[PDB]
């Protein structure tokens, strides 16, 4: 699905509000992209479907920390 | 034929009889079909006897 592998961000629902305040069901989707991250510890590339915020999280932490968290969550990458 | 004097028996003589109980059962069934069995209770009796011997076999088979 359209779920971020790092942050878990998935599509949420809300309203499109018009100027007359008409409410229509809409979805907010995560800014998801498939990206190959260079795991230096593994000397390889791991492809993750992450949001841009997930990429920022991997920049802040390491890709090793995030991969350990994914493994703890049991998500296969 | 009660359960005491069948539990005193062994797995082999008890497999003998239940085989011959079955035999008896088949003869009684053919006799009742032909109409010569004027003792209907023998069918139920030999059936319960077969059940008893198979019970005792399942007991003597280990637990």
């Amino acid at each position: 699905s359209r779920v971020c592998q790092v942050t878990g961000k998935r599509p949420v629902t809300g309203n499109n509000r018009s100027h007359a305040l008409n409410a229509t069901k809409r979805r907010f989707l995560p800014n998801l992209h498939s990206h190959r991250f260079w795991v230096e510890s593994e000397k390889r590339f791991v492809t993750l479907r992450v949001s841009a915020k997930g990429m920022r999280v991997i920049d802040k932490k390491g890709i090793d920390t995030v991969l350990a968290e994914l493994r703890a969550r049991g998500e296969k990458y | 034929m009660k359960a005491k004097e069948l539990r005193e028996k062994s797995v082999e003589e008890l497999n003998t009889e239940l085989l011959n109980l079955l035999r008896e059962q088949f003869n009684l069934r053919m006799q009742a079909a032909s109409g010569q069995l004027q003792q209907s209770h023998l069918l139920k009796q030999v059936r319960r006897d077969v059940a008893r011997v198979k019970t005792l076999l399942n007991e003597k088979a280990g637990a």
């Binding site: - | 085989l19 079955l22 035999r23 088949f26 069934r29 053919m30 079909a33 032909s34």
Partner: protein, 93 residues
């Protein structure tokens, strides 16, 4: 080798009727109500073991039960298997 405990279940009854009488009369064929499972090989082994006769061939058919109306209820009799056992040459025993 079919076991004797199974052979003693295979056969249920002899089937008495005009066609069965004629079959035993002029074709040496005994008609039996047999079990439902009752393969032809099981029926042959059982007849040869229990009736100790010599069997040539076994023809089998399934008789479907009749829908009977007992009182004001609709009932159905059980299907049963019928075997035409042709004895080889000598005679029934």
């Amino acid at each position: 080798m079919i076991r004797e405990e199974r052979l003693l279940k295979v056969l249920r009854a002899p089937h008495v009727s005009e066609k069965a009488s004629t079959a035993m009369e002029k074709s040496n064929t005994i008609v039996l109500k047999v079990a439902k499972d009752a393969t032809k090989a099981e029926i042959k082994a059982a007849v040869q073991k229990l009736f100790e006769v010599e069997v040539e061939v076994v023809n089998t058919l399934v008789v479907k039960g009749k829908v009977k109306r007992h009182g004001q209820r609709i009932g159905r009799r059980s299907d049963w298997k019928k075997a035409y056992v042709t004895l080889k040459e000598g005679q029934n025993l």
